[PDB]
Amino acid sequence: ARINTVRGPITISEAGFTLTHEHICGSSAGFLRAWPEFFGSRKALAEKAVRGLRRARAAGVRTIVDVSTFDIGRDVSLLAEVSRAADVHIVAATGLWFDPPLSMRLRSVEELTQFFLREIQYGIEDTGIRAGIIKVATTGKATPFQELVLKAAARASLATGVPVTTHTAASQRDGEQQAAIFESEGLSPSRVCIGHSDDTDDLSYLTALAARGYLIGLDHIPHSAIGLEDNASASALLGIRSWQTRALLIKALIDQGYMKQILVSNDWLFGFSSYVTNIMDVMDRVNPDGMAFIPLRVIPFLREKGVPQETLAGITVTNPARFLSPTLR
Amino acid sequence: ARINTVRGPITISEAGFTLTHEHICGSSAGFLRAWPEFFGSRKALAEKAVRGLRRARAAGVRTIVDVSTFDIGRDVSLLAEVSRAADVHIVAATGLWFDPPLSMRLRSVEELTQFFLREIQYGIEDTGIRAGIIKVATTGKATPFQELVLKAAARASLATGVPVTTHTAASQRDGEQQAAIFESEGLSPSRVCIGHSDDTDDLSYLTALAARGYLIGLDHIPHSAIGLEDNASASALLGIRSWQTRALLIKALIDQGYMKQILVSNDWLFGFSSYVTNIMDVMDRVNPDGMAFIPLRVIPFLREKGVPQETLAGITVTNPARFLSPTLR
Ligand SMILES: CCOP(=O)(Cc1ccc(C)cc1)OCC
Ligand SMILES: CCOP(=O)(Cc1ccc(C)cc1)OCC
Ligand SMILES: CCOP(=O)(Cc1ccc(C)cc1)OCC
Ligand SMILES: CCOP(=O)(Cc1ccc(C)cc1)OCC
Ligand SMILES: [Zn+2]
Ligand SMILES: [Zn+2]
Ligand SMILES: [Zn+2]
Ligand SMILES: [Zn+2]
């Protein structure tokens, strides 16, 4: 019935056009509060974010899912502020990414489950703001720790009905191992979105997951270091496949009958301390549309390639609504 | 002239008996805020801490230096609250330990220097509380990143006059490489304390460093898992050397004429999330005296072994004052 946002619960119908994998800021736990000047200032950053969100809003975006976990330096107070100023719904996450500190690395599956439930049921920190999704990550073969995270995510999910979204090394088929883990915990594929999937040209890997019930996240659309190879760092991060190629995978899946299984996003951000210094400069150069990239460039592009408008609407309105709706077994 | 505490600046005379390496809590950045229940509750942790500090105060302790860095999950507001409540001065730290997140790992020596200076000159977070010491660490041969940390700690020390205290793997003779880098930076040894030095029986290593003008940190006196060989975990952490063995190193150094270079502490804490679950329990059992261990147990012991009281007062009062006083080259 309802989805938890940083401003409270909204009904399914209020979500509207939703971007399923984004970030206000990409950082580290405690970083933004200890070194705000790294981003110029906290004020500078929030302003940037608001402007960005207002632009996406103007394009039709009504809601975003900020998948920043505790180790991504998620700051729920920053999220609540910009959500209110931009008037954009923001769904917060719980979960763990790949940079956990010792206090986390040393926990058991049982403890991690506990923490995930806390974030979801009780709320984040002392705010009362409840997470609406669980984020997990692997990057090639899962580490023993990661496996734990995966199980914990599954259990928390099984208890709450809240979906799970993942970060993968697409080219390594991480999705496959993740699914194996989730299934072993009894998790239903329809509550899982395997992300960064557009990062591979292997349609057969994607179609096999789709077939099993999983949701496929085509969220690195605008990531391309095309014409920037003069920059190793940018190249390494964004890759060299064009945005059109990535977009085409969306059509490719539609064509195979998996439209109900597709979720699309930008995986964008307004600040990024967890990478090389000044990386944002490069990014804002690569995609000046920011999070408005999807509605502004991708929707028209697919339309133009023959995708029916109704179909696009299902993908950006319907799929997300279903995904996000907390659903128990 | 004055030393920075979490309650403000105090005069050197005001510091009295000082504990140079301690912690209110051993954790991770953001952890305390995110999962306070891991310590029962923030209030519980705070109460435990006040009691513990009141007892040390009762034994003569006027000031403690909490060497918890950003990566240790230092919570200055927490430090401030128990400091006020227990009526004990607390000196806060800047620097980095060995669990830095990606947002730090990726910084340059120049950016790191700036962060350090920030904490010292402007304040920690937004509290206006200024760090009174710089904490760095190695765990055997320094890593590239650790080398950077050491240079930055050096540089910030040079500009502000604040001392540097370190975490070593004494067994490995880390002190030697530490000194090497500091010296390569023009840093006076007299502004450095090589910690956890009681962790080794190598008097050759010790006297060398002392001979050189470095301060020797004998802060693991109470760490011993004797009678706990049953516990792999506590054994690993604590060692199997008795407290007496460690305590005697203090006598040895005095004996060689190095009384003015010794600094003693307990390296105690009231909370510890960065280790196995329930470890505190084990610790409380091993040393019920907590931070009062030194005055209650070590002082009299050394007395009984022949050390002049007057000498013991130099070690606990004079040495620290001198080390802590901001001193420029
Ligand atoms: C915050 C998570 O970052 P990520 O997993 C993915 C990521 C890469 C590039 C851009 C523009 C956004 C997000 O990679 C950082 C090393
Ligand atoms: C944070 C401590 O709360 P708790 O133990 C139980 C708890 C859940 C929900 C609400 C509204 C209050 C308390 O967390 C759930 C795992
Ligand atoms: C927080 C710093 O702890 P440390 O560096 C060393 C340490 C060990 C034991 C005790 C009682 C205190 C401190 O522990 C590594 C996990
Ligand atoms: C905004 C953070 O302050 P700043 O850039 C300069 C600064 C230092 C000290 C005081 C009292 C005010 C301002 O930090 C120094 C490294
Ligand atoms: Zn990701
Ligand atoms: Zn992401
Ligand atoms: Zn240490
Ligand atoms: Zn310590």
Side-chain angles (χ1 to χ4, degrees), chain B residues 126-155:
Chain B
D126 57 353
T127 74
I129 284 167
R130 308 201 273 238
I133 185 169
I134 306 145
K135 163 69 179 286
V136 306
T138 54
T139 195
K141 162 210 254 162
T143 61
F145 184 68
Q146 279 164 15
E147 292 184 45
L148 292 195
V149 178
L150 258 60
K151 286 153 172 276
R155 288 168 206 193

PDB file of all heavy atoms in Angstrom, chain B residues 126-155:
ATOM      1  N   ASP B 126      31.462  20.335  12.881  1.00  0.00           N
ATOM      2  CA  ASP B 126      31.004  21.688  13.035  1.00  0.00           C
ATOM      3  C   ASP B 126      30.998  22.167  14.484  1.00  0.00           C
ATOM      4  O   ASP B 126      30.403  23.173  14.795  1.00  0.00           O
ATOM      5  CB  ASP B 126      29.537  21.719  12.512  1.00  0.00           C
ATOM      6  CG  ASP B 126      28.601  20.730  13.208  1.00  0.00           C
ATOM      7  OD1 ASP B 126      29.186  19.902  14.047  1.00  0.00           O
ATOM      8  OD2 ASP B 126      27.411  20.706  12.982  1.00  0.00           O
ATOM      9  N   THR B 127      31.629  21.451  15.364  1.00  0.00           N
ATOM     10  CA  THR B 127      31.599  21.772  16.774  1.00  0.00           C
ATOM     11  C   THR B 127      32.529  22.859  17.254  1.00  0.00           C
ATOM     12  O   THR B 127      32.390  23.396  18.378  1.00  0.00           O
ATOM     13  CB  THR B 127      32.008  20.502  17.510  1.00  0.00           C
ATOM     14  OG1 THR B 127      33.413  20.349  17.333  1.00  0.00           O
ATOM     15  CG2 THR B 127      31.235  19.336  16.922  1.00  0.00           C
ATOM     16  N   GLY B 128      33.520  23.161  16.457  1.00  0.00           N
ATOM     17  CA  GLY B 128      34.468  24.152  16.911  1.00  0.00           C
ATOM     18  C   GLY B 128      35.467  23.540  17.918  1.00  0.00           C
ATOM     19  O   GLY B 128      36.321  24.232  18.418  1.00  0.00           O
ATOM     20  N   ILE B 129      35.360  22.231  18.199  1.00  0.00           N
ATOM     21  CA  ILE B 129      36.266  21.548  19.130  1.00  0.00           C
ATOM     22  C   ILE B 129      37.561  21.261  18.382  1.00  0.00           C
ATOM     23  O   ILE B 129      37.536  20.650  17.332  1.00  0.00           O
ATOM     24  CB  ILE B 129      35.648  20.231  19.613  1.00  0.00           C
ATOM     25  CG1 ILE B 129      34.576  20.562  20.647  1.00  0.00           C
ATOM     26  CG2 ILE B 129      36.698  19.359  20.320  1.00  0.00           C
ATOM     27  CD1 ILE B 129      33.712  19.339  20.911  1.00  0.00           C
ATOM     28  N   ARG B 130      38.693  21.690  18.911  1.00  0.00           N
ATOM     29  CA  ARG B 130      39.959  21.473  18.235  1.00  0.00           C
ATOM     30  C   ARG B 130      40.801  20.324  18.725  1.00  0.00           C
ATOM     31  O   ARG B 130      40.941  20.134  19.893  1.00  0.00           O
ATOM     32  CB  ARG B 130      40.741  22.749  18.187  1.00  0.00           C
ATOM     33  CG  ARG B 130      39.803  23.754  17.616  1.00  0.00           C
ATOM     34  CD  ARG B 130      40.517  24.908  17.039  1.00  0.00           C
ATOM     35  NE  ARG B 130      40.814  25.975  17.974  1.00  0.00           N
ATOM     36  CZ  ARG B 130      40.384  27.252  17.785  1.00  0.00           C
ATOM     37  NH1 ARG B 130      39.596  27.643  16.770  1.00  0.00           N
ATOM     38  NH2 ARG B 130      40.742  28.186  18.649  1.00  0.00           N
ATOM     39  N   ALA B 131      41.390  19.566  17.792  1.00  0.00           N
ATOM     40  CA  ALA B 131      42.238  18.432  18.134  1.00  0.00           C
ATOM     41  C   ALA B 131      43.525  18.871  18.820  1.00  0.00           C
ATOM     42  O   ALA B 131      44.157  19.817  18.420  1.00  0.00           O
ATOM     43  CB  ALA B 131      42.576  17.610  16.903  1.00  0.00           C
ATOM     44  N   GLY B 132      43.922  18.142  19.843  1.00  0.00           N
ATOM     45  CA  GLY B 132      45.119  18.484  20.540  1.00  0.00           C
ATOM     46  C   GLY B 132      46.281  17.565  20.209  1.00  0.00           C
ATOM     47  O   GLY B 132      47.343  17.762  20.732  1.00  0.00           O
ATOM     48  N   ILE B 133      46.084  16.563  19.348  1.00  0.00           N
ATOM     49  CA  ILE B 133      47.170  15.690  18.981  1.00  0.00           C
ATOM     50  C   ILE B 133      46.872  15.000  17.638  1.00  0.00           C
ATOM     51  O   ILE B 133      45.705  14.844  17.239  1.00  0.00           O
ATOM     52  CB  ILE B 133      47.365  14.633  20.065  1.00  0.00           C
ATOM     53  CG1 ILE B 133      48.575  13.761  19.804  1.00  0.00           C
ATOM     54  CG2 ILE B 133      46.172  13.709  20.099  1.00  0.00           C
ATOM     55  CD1 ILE B 133      48.877  12.914  21.023  1.00  0.00           C
ATOM     56  N   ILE B 134      47.926  14.524  16.965  1.00  0.00           N
ATOM     57  CA  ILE B 134      47.728  13.812  15.695  1.00  0.00           C
ATOM     58  C   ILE B 134      48.076  12.344  15.852  1.00  0.00           C
ATOM     59  O   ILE B 134      49.199  12.003  16.247  1.00  0.00           O
ATOM     60  CB  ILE B 134      48.543  14.410  14.544  1.00  0.00           C
ATOM     61  CG1 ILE B 134      48.314  15.892  14.357  1.00  0.00           C
ATOM     62  CG2 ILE B 134      48.275  13.702  13.221  1.00  0.00           C
ATOM     63  CD1 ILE B 134      49.606  16.524  13.927  1.00  0.00           C
ATOM     64  N   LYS B 135      47.116  11.490  15.514  1.00  0.00           N
ATOM     65  CA  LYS B 135      47.293  10.060  15.610  1.00  0.00           C
ATOM     66  C   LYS B 135      47.470   9.349  14.261  1.00  0.00           C
ATOM     67  O   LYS B 135      46.632   9.490  13.373  1.00  0.00           O
ATOM     68  CB  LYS B 135      46.048   9.469  16.287  1.00  0.00           C
ATOM     69  CG  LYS B 135      45.906   7.972  16.085  1.00  0.00           C
ATOM     70  CD  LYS B 135      46.997   7.246  16.840  1.00  0.00           C
ATOM     71  CE  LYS B 135      46.843   5.771  16.658  1.00  0.00           C
ATOM     72  NZ  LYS B 135      45.723   5.249  17.440  1.00  0.00           N
ATOM     73  N   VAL B 136      48.557   8.544  14.128  1.00  0.00           N
ATOM     74  CA  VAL B 136      48.808   7.767  12.924  1.00  0.00           C
ATOM     75  C   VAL B 136      49.151   6.331  13.307  1.00  0.00           C
ATOM     76  O   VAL B 136      49.423   6.040  14.458  1.00  0.00           O
ATOM     77  CB  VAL B 136      49.903   8.351  12.064  1.00  0.00           C
ATOM     78  CG1 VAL B 136      49.576   9.802  11.754  1.00  0.00           C
ATOM     79  CG2 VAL B 136      51.280   8.204  12.723  1.00  0.00           C
ATOM     80  N   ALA B 137      49.129   5.447  12.350  1.00  0.00           N
ATOM     81  CA  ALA B 137      49.410   4.039  12.596  1.00  0.00           C
ATOM     82  C   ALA B 137      49.980   3.251  11.398  1.00  0.00           C
ATOM     83  O   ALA B 137      49.724   3.549  10.235  1.00  0.00           O
ATOM     84  CB  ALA B 137      48.067   3.417  12.846  1.00  0.00           C
ATOM     85  N   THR B 138      50.703   2.207  11.749  1.00  0.00           N
ATOM     86  CA  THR B 138      51.281   1.188  10.873  1.00  0.00           C
ATOM     87  C   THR B 138      51.083  -0.135  11.611  1.00  0.00           C
ATOM     88  O   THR B 138      50.953  -0.119  12.849  1.00  0.00           O
ATOM     89  CB  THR B 138      52.770   1.332  10.466  1.00  0.00           C
ATOM     90  OG1 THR B 138      53.673   1.466  11.563  1.00  0.00           O
ATOM     91  CG2 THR B 138      52.941   2.446   9.464  1.00  0.00           C
ATOM     92  N   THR B 139      51.047  -1.241  10.850  1.00  0.00           N
ATOM     93  CA  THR B 139      50.876  -2.634  11.325  1.00  0.00           C
ATOM     94  C   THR B 139      51.867  -3.525  10.527  1.00  0.00           C
ATOM     95  O   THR B 139      51.503  -4.494   9.856  1.00  0.00           O
ATOM     96  CB  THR B 139      49.378  -3.068  11.216  1.00  0.00           C
ATOM     97  OG1 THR B 139      49.107  -4.239  11.962  1.00  0.00           O
ATOM     98  CG2 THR B 139      48.920  -3.212   9.778  1.00  0.00           C
ATOM     99  N   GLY B 140      53.143  -3.168  10.722  1.00  0.00           N
ATOM    100  CA  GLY B 140      54.292  -3.739  10.077  1.00  0.00           C
ATOM    101  C   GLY B 140      54.738  -2.761   9.009  1.00  0.00           C
ATOM    102  O   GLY B 140      54.431  -1.560   9.098  1.00  0.00           O
ATOM    103  N   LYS B 141      55.440  -3.259   7.992  1.00  0.00           N
ATOM    104  CA  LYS B 141      55.925  -2.410   6.913  1.00  0.00           C
ATOM    105  C   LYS B 141      54.804  -1.438   6.460  1.00  0.00           C
ATOM    106  O   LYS B 141      53.683  -1.856   6.133  1.00  0.00           O
ATOM    107  CB  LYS B 141      56.597  -3.275   5.829  1.00  0.00           C
ATOM    108  CG  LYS B 141      56.806  -2.682   4.437  1.00  0.00           C
ATOM    109  CD  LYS B 141      56.772  -3.761   3.342  1.00  0.00           C
ATOM    110  CE  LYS B 141      58.135  -4.118   2.746  1.00  0.00           C
ATOM    111  NZ  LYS B 141      58.141  -5.414   2.037  1.00  0.00           N
ATOM    112  N   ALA B 142      55.065  -0.108   6.467  1.00  0.00           N
ATOM    113  CA  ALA B 142      54.034   0.842   6.045  1.00  0.00           C
ATOM    114  C   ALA B 142      53.569   0.625   4.605  1.00  0.00           C
ATOM    115  O   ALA B 142      54.344   0.208   3.718  1.00  0.00           O
ATOM    116  CB  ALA B 142      54.542   2.273   6.120  1.00  0.00           C
ATOM    117  N   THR B 143      52.287   0.934   4.378  1.00  0.00           N
ATOM    118  CA  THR B 143      51.734   0.858   3.054  1.00  0.00           C
ATOM    119  C   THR B 143      51.953   2.217   2.409  1.00  0.00           C
ATOM    120  O   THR B 143      52.210   3.241   3.088  1.00  0.00           O
ATOM    121  CB  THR B 143      50.240   0.514   2.985  1.00  0.00           C
ATOM    122  OG1 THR B 143      49.449   1.474   3.633  1.00  0.00           O
ATOM    123  CG2 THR B 143      50.013  -0.826   3.617  1.00  0.00           C
ATOM    124  N   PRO B 144      51.823   2.225   1.102  1.00  0.00           N
ATOM    125  CA  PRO B 144      52.007   3.435   0.404  1.00  0.00           C
ATOM    126  C   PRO B 144      51.135   4.492   1.008  1.00  0.00           C
ATOM    127  O   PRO B 144      51.590   5.559   1.370  1.00  0.00           O
ATOM    128  CB  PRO B 144      51.599   3.098  -1.018  1.00  0.00           C
ATOM    129  CG  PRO B 144      51.924   1.633  -1.196  1.00  0.00           C
ATOM    130  CD  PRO B 144      51.879   1.041   0.187  1.00  0.00           C
ATOM    131  N   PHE B 145      49.876   4.154   1.159  1.00  0.00           N
ATOM    132  CA  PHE B 145      48.978   5.104   1.740  1.00  0.00           C
ATOM    133  C   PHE B 145      49.396   5.524   3.142  1.00  0.00           C
ATOM    134  O   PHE B 145      49.396   6.696   3.506  1.00  0.00           O
ATOM    135  CB  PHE B 145      47.574   4.565   1.716  1.00  0.00           C
ATOM    136  CG  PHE B 145      46.625   5.585   2.234  1.00  0.00           C
ATOM    137  CD1 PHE B 145      46.358   6.760   1.524  1.00  0.00           C
ATOM    138  CD2 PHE B 145      46.002   5.373   3.467  1.00  0.00           C
ATOM    139  CE1 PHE B 145      45.472   7.717   2.032  1.00  0.00           C
ATOM    140  CE2 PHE B 145      45.094   6.302   3.975  1.00  0.00           C
ATOM    141  CZ  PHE B 145      44.845   7.483   3.257  1.00  0.00           C
ATOM    142  N   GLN B 146      49.769   4.565   3.944  1.00  0.00           N
ATOM    143  CA  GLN B 146      50.222   4.901   5.271  1.00  0.00           C
ATOM    144  C   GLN B 146      51.382   5.849   5.213  1.00  0.00           C
ATOM    145  O   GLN B 146      51.504   6.716   6.071  1.00  0.00           O
ATOM    146  CB  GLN B 146      50.659   3.662   6.018  1.00  0.00           C
ATOM    147  CG  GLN B 146      49.444   2.950   6.597  1.00  0.00           C
ATOM    148  CD  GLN B 146      49.797   1.546   6.998  1.00  0.00           C
ATOM    149  OE1 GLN B 146      50.981   1.182   7.101  1.00  0.00           O
ATOM    150  NE2 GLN B 146      48.767   0.771   7.225  1.00  0.00           N
ATOM    151  N   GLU B 147      52.253   5.705   4.198  1.00  0.00           N
ATOM    152  CA  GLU B 147      53.407   6.633   4.117  1.00  0.00           C
ATOM    153  C   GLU B 147      52.947   8.054   3.913  1.00  0.00           C
ATOM    154  O   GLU B 147      53.542   9.012   4.398  1.00  0.00           O
ATOM    155  CB  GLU B 147      54.317   6.329   2.939  1.00  0.00           C
ATOM    156  CG  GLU B 147      55.064   5.004   3.080  1.00  0.00           C
ATOM    157  CD  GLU B 147      56.025   4.784   1.952  1.00  0.00           C
ATOM    158  OE1 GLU B 147      56.732   5.854   1.666  1.00  0.00           O
ATOM    159  OE2 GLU B 147      56.094   3.730   1.337  1.00  0.00           O
ATOM    160  N   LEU B 148      51.850   8.158   3.174  1.00  0.00           N
ATOM    161  CA  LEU B 148      51.256   9.459   2.892  1.00  0.00           C
ATOM    162  C   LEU B 148      50.706  10.064   4.143  1.00  0.00           C
ATOM    163  O   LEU B 148      50.853  11.271   4.393  1.00  0.00           O
ATOM    164  CB  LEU B 148      50.122   9.380   1.845  1.00  0.00           C
ATOM    165  CG  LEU B 148      50.577   9.026   0.424  1.00  0.00           C
ATOM    166  CD1 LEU B 148      49.429   9.355  -0.529  1.00  0.00           C
ATOM    167  CD2 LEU B 148      51.830   9.820   0.039  1.00  0.00           C
ATOM    168  N   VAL B 149      50.039   9.210   4.912  1.00  0.00           N
ATOM    169  CA  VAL B 149      49.447   9.643   6.161  1.00  0.00           C
ATOM    170  C   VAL B 149      50.512  10.176   7.087  1.00  0.00           C
ATOM    171  O   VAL B 149      50.326  11.178   7.799  1.00  0.00           O
ATOM    172  CB  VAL B 149      48.762   8.491   6.885  1.00  0.00           C
ATOM    173  CG1 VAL B 149      48.179   8.961   8.238  1.00  0.00           C
ATOM    174  CG2 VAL B 149      47.656   7.942   6.029  1.00  0.00           C
ATOM    175  N   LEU B 150      51.630   9.483   7.099  1.00  0.00           N
ATOM    176  CA  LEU B 150      52.733   9.861   8.012  1.00  0.00           C
ATOM    177  C   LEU B 150      53.351  11.228   7.657  1.00  0.00           C
ATOM    178  O   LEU B 150      53.679  12.024   8.563  1.00  0.00           O
ATOM    179  CB  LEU B 150      53.782   8.674   8.099  1.00  0.00           C
ATOM    180  CG  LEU B 150      53.737   7.754   9.351  1.00  0.00           C
ATOM    181  CD1 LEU B 150      52.410   7.056   9.493  1.00  0.00           C
ATOM    182  CD2 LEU B 150      54.784   6.680   9.244  1.00  0.00           C
ATOM    183  N   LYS B 151      53.501  11.485   6.315  1.00  0.00           N
ATOM    184  CA  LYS B 151      54.026  12.741   5.822  1.00  0.00           C
ATOM    185  C   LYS B 151      53.098  13.865   6.164  1.00  0.00           C
ATOM    186  O   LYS B 151      53.544  14.920   6.603  1.00  0.00           O
ATOM    187  CB  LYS B 151      54.214  12.722   4.322  1.00  0.00           C
ATOM    188  CG  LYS B 151      55.426  11.885   3.981  1.00  0.00           C
ATOM    189  CD  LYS B 151      55.370  11.260   2.612  1.00  0.00           C
ATOM    190  CE  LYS B 151      56.699  10.596   2.265  1.00  0.00           C
ATOM    191  NZ  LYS B 151      57.701  11.518   1.704  1.00  0.00           N
ATOM    192  N   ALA B 152      51.790  13.637   5.921  1.00  0.00           N
ATOM    193  CA  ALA B 152      50.782  14.672   6.229  1.00  0.00           C
ATOM    194  C   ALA B 152      50.712  15.013   7.701  1.00  0.00           C
ATOM    195  O   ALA B 152      50.583  16.187   8.064  1.00  0.00           O
ATOM    196  CB  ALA B 152      49.415  14.314   5.723  1.00  0.00           C
ATOM    197  N   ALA B 153      50.813  13.963   8.551  1.00  0.00           N
ATOM    198  CA  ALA B 153      50.810  14.132  10.034  1.00  0.00           C
ATOM    199  C   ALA B 153      52.013  14.984  10.389  1.00  0.00           C
ATOM    200  O   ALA B 153      51.960  15.908  11.217  1.00  0.00           O
ATOM    201  CB  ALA B 153      50.937  12.768  10.699  1.00  0.00           C
ATOM    202  N   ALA B 154      53.132  14.693   9.693  1.00  0.00           N
ATOM    203  CA  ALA B 154      54.342  15.468   9.942  1.00  0.00           C
ATOM    204  C   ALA B 154      54.173  16.932   9.611  1.00  0.00           C
ATOM    205  O   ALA B 154      54.530  17.833  10.388  1.00  0.00           O
ATOM    206  CB  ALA B 154      55.598  14.882   9.302  1.00  0.00           C
ATOM    207  N   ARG B 155      53.634  17.156   8.444  1.00  0.00           N
ATOM    208  CA  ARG B 155      53.412  18.499   7.991  1.00  0.00           C
ATOM    209  C   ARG B 155      52.424  19.237   8.859  1.00  0.00           C
ATOM    210  O   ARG B 155      52.601  20.368   9.255  1.00  0.00           O
ATOM    211  CB  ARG B 155      52.981  18.452   6.558  1.00  0.00           C
ATOM    212  CG  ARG B 155      54.170  18.080   5.686  1.00  0.00           C
ATOM    213  CD  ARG B 155      53.777  17.733   4.259  1.00  0.00           C
ATOM    214  NE  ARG B 155      54.751  16.840   3.630  1.00  0.00           N
ATOM    215  CZ  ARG B 155      54.797  16.570   2.339  1.00  0.00           C
ATOM    216  NH1 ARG B 155      53.943  17.112   1.496  1.00  0.00           N
ATOM    217  NH2 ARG B 155      55.720  15.732   1.877  1.00  0.00           N
TER     218      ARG B 155
END
